[PDB]
From a paper:
All 9 off7_Hxx_3G124 constructs were able to bind MBP and GFP simultaneously, demonstrating the absence of steric hindrance between the two targets, consistent with the structural models. Two DD constructs yielded crystals of the ternary complex: off7:MBP_H10_3G124:GFP crystallized in space group C2 (3.1 Å resolution, 3 complexes/ asymmetric unit (a.u.)) and off7:MBP_H11_3G124:GFP in space group P21212 (3.0 Å resolution). All three components of the complexes were well-resolved in the electron density maps. The structures of off7:MBP_H10_3G124:GFP and off7:MBP_H11_3G124:GFP confirm that DD fusions are capable of crystallizing with two target proteins bound simultaneously. In the complexes, the interactions between DARPins and target proteins were found to be very similar to the interactions seen in the absence of fusion partners. This is an important observation, as this reassures that any conclusions derived from complexes of DD and DDD fusions will also be valid for individual DARPins.
In this paper, we present a strategy to fuse specific, high-affinity protein binders to obtain multivalent or multispecific scaffolds of predetermined geometry. DARPins are used as building blocks to confer the desired specificity to the construct. A series of rigid connector modules replacing the DARPin capping repeats allow to combine the individual DARPin domains in such a way that their distance and angle can be altered to test different geometries, bringing the binding partners of the DARPins into a defined spatial arrangement. The two helices are not just joined end-to-end, but instead the two domains are made to overlap in such a way that the joining helix is stabilized by contacts with the domain cores along its entire length.
Author numbering:
A (entry chain C): 1 to 64, 68 to 230
B (entry chain A): 6 to 325
C (entry chain B): 5 to 368
The structure:
Amino acid sequence: SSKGEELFTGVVPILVELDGDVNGHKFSVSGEGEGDATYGKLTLKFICTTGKLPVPWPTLVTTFVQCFSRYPDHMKRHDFFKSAMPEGYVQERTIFFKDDGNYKTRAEVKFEGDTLVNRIELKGIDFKEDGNILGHKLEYNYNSHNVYIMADKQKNGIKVNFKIRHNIEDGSVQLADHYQQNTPIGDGPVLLPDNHYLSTQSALSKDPNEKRDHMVLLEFVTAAGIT
Amino acid sequence: HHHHHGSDLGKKLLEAARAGQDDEVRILMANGADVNAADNTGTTPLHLAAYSGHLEIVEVLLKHGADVDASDVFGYTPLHLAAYWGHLEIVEVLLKNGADVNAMDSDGMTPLHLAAKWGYLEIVEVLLKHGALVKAKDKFGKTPKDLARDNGNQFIYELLEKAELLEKLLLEAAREGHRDRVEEFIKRGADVNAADDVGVTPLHLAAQRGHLEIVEVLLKCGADVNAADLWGQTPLHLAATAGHLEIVEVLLKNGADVNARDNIGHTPLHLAAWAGHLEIVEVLLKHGADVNAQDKFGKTPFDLAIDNGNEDIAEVLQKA
Amino acid sequence: GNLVIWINGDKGYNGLAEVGKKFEKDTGIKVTVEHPDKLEEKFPQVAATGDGPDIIFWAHDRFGGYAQSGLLAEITPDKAFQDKLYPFTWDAVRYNGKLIAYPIAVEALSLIYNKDLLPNPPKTWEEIPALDKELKAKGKSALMFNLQEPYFTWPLIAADGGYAFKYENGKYDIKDVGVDNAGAKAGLTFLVDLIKNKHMNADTDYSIAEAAFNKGETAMTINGPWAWSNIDTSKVNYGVTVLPTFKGQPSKPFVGVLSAGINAASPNKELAKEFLENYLLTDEGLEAVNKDKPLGAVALKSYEEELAKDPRIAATMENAQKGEIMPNIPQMSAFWYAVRTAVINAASGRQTVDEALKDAQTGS
């Protein structure tokens, strides 16, 4: 079996590092844990090292390793994230918060030893000072979404686009439109996938012992739509 | 656990126990005084007798029916005072009478934190033998180790870090599955219910990895079957997630909660159907599991079967 | 031609009579003194009618209410005579930045210690727990003082930044209060840690503390120069020293400054300023009254040194210098009840440190 497949037959330690900037508010966050592609499960815990976080944790969930997704036997041929490994791939997005600022992310997803790292850079501009983001008005829960993927031969990668639903404390809904593109880093061949989609679960938590502004995450991700 | 009485006969009893007048305490027992009398601040005769060091009085009040885990307003119990004041003889009797070994107070300080701050080597090893978990963190996150050093008790520091080390080895043994190593560490004083900074115990590790032999050994010595990590996952969840049938049986036989839910809201049955485990599903049903449990996103175990393309598993559930 | 003086009974009124005999000797002014108790409640009523003498003798806190109603005249001592008294003693007579009375004596708190049981007393609050254990083994307590009245507990909570009302260039900021600051929140918590750990019991009064120390049941206490006579009666060999240091900085006890003002409705004001400056404030005048009743500290910087020969008073003066002067504005009525009620609840767990001190901050 290919390397990408053999690397995710069991549990894999995970590292996540990020540095961000939002309307002159520069911060940095790091988290760690582990994942299991065989079951799509992700167990993580993110800590803010730069004092307190000036943005809500839900906004950054997508930013913070889709290679840990469950691809059934009937559609392993469409698993691009694993094929790109262990070489890695660069992930870029442009998050459009409706009636507010926007994020731009650049991330490298590669193996550093046996650990899988996700190093990121976050850029935020044009956010309203008393908006939902900079005003901390978003609830501390996450909904479910379906990510849609389609090949991109001319760029050798995948064109991913989806929209997230954030819940505000007043009972309203905020949209964050995600325009995403993933291109590998190694010359090794990759499996460009047909038009397929995913389905995600999430639930955010806390830790009574950790005294720093943090977050806990539990996710389940699976592919479907094709037989 | 906690009182708040009030009586003239009680006030006489507290003063009598504080000063250590053994006899006058006994006369008050027969004369109608309340053994569990509490004053304004919730202090009982057992509190004053434990801090005063009058073992005679302590023994009597336990025989009569004093609350060993009585928590005054500040969270202190007879074990806190008996430890803050270094009364080894009293710390040994309150433990024989089933006292909460790791009793947090208002500030999260457990009895061990106190035995470490002042450096009572005797009380320490006593509390450790009765299951006092080492990595007990308070409001300021200062474990007994982080607190023993701040006061210059270096022999305590080593004996603690030498214990925290054993616990980490117990997880590594259970994770990799070495039955002989895991037996060594338990015999050396490694708390079976030792949870690392992420809240996982060697019971989860022996269940998710499928090391049956190590499981019952942890349970036999008193491993918490319903132990939850920071994500609310139970050794029963991980036994179904991975699909190790034999461990699922043992966990239930020992009292594994079938209705448990992770931080998303997945029952052990939600996971068995997810991971496509034909037999694991029939076992959880055999033990009466909520057929129509809805996670945080309102999806039954039936739904998780279809979305993943699990034919037979879905059918089995639709029948039940 | 005539002049009367009121005073309390506990103080030495006899010696004062001898001083009034000399003033009538040199210029023929009739001097008379009588001391009816409850004179503090009797002054504001008699002050409106204009009766009652010019010279009064009482603490400075009550003059803030007398001067508030404009019943005491402004004094004007010589700039050179002020050099004879300590500067910080005049902060008790400045109302709205103006003098309204003459300083007399000082009265501050000091710790006592039984030398027969503890020769070297500790110098820091932090080392009493270890000392209490050391002494509890021998069936005796280390410290035990009045906790109800906050006057005895304020020295600690005020050490690490706590203050009643901000004092600036002779005026108090009614807006600013120093009870919710994190400095005092750290002080009180250490005190509660003693009650929490059974070093002291919350239900301790002045009467209970005095009784214990006088019978050797304890090794330390706190009190002013008013109870020093009762200890020698109990035959206990005692000593006085500075109050220990919390966080390394000394304690801030409220400083009581005996004062003497001038009634605004008297016909002979200049006939009292003459006596209070040249005839009363003298090494002979103070020595006579002190012989009748020990006064403790002294306003005159000179005779204070003559008394400093006794280590009791030398130690008492150090406490006043290292402490804030008790405010005199009427807002203290809403402060005592606010704090005195907060100290009890916090020291009993009925309210936390923050809850009990923010509610006290609203009262002010």
